[PDB]
């Protein structure tokens with residue numbers, strides 16, 4: 609199977625942020641039109657705990673035909689309830705959720721494939737720590753947590769290097785490899801794609817566990833179009 613591409617629509621104040629703003633419905637519909645397998649839909653306000661865009665996010669999901677991965681501040685019963693209640697295929701439980709490790713284990717049993725766990729990674733003196741984007745504190749060691757979630761039956765991981773996210777500086781192929789080598793759960797890469805060559809680079813890891821790649825900035829920078837990226841990975 610070819611690498612999956614998930615175009616990213618990040619919502620702030622009820623508009624898609626790309627610094628330019630515009631309709632989030634339209635952005636997602638346009639990506640689906642260009643032939644998106646999935647949309648990665650993000651409530652940035654909810655991720656930073658600063659606001660909420662559920663009602664708008666529920667609209668976006670209801671209007672699309674394609675698979676939607678929902679993400680942003682998904683951290684507890686209420687936040688997980690509203691996310692699943694949009695009818696999205698998948699929700700992305702944020703790194704910040706790891707503050708309550710048993711909540712994570714409990715919701716993994718309850719929801720199974722509907723749940724992915726976000727791993728936002730920062731190398732600190734060589735060490736792979738977890739530090740949620742939008743979160744104020746450290747969330748533990750990557751490998752200790754990846755192992756724990758793998759034995760708890762985690763169905764998929766979303767792996768970000770917080771230092772490459774939105775930077776167009778290339779992905780962290782060491783991190784993508786390291787994670788995937790350590791688990792049979794599908795891995796979705798997020799952050800730092802600059803080119804079609806990066807996609808192709810990510811695609812080489814499909815075989816050891818990287819099924820997909822989320823792309824935001826390189827699409828809005830017009831570095832490549834979606835059908836181009838779809839071609840290159842096939």
Ligand SMILES: O=C(O)c1ccccc1NC[C@@H](O)[C@H](O)[C@H](O)COP(=O)(O)O
Nearest residue numbers: 616655679741774798799800823824825
């Ligand atoms: O996706 C999330 O859950 C999240 C949470 C807090 C802060 C940022 C977040 N993600 C924004 C995200 O959708 C980025 O656009 C993707 O990681 C794409 O990376 P980019 O291609 O822009 O380098």
Ligand SMILES: [Cl-]
Nearest residue numbers: 680681682702
């Ligand atoms: Cl989340």
Ligand code: NA
Nearest residue numbers: 727728766768
């Ligand atoms: Na992540």
Ligand code: NA
Nearest residue numbers: 770771772773
């Ligand atoms: Na970054």
Ligand code: NA
Nearest residue numbers: 799800801822
């Ligand atoms: Na990317």
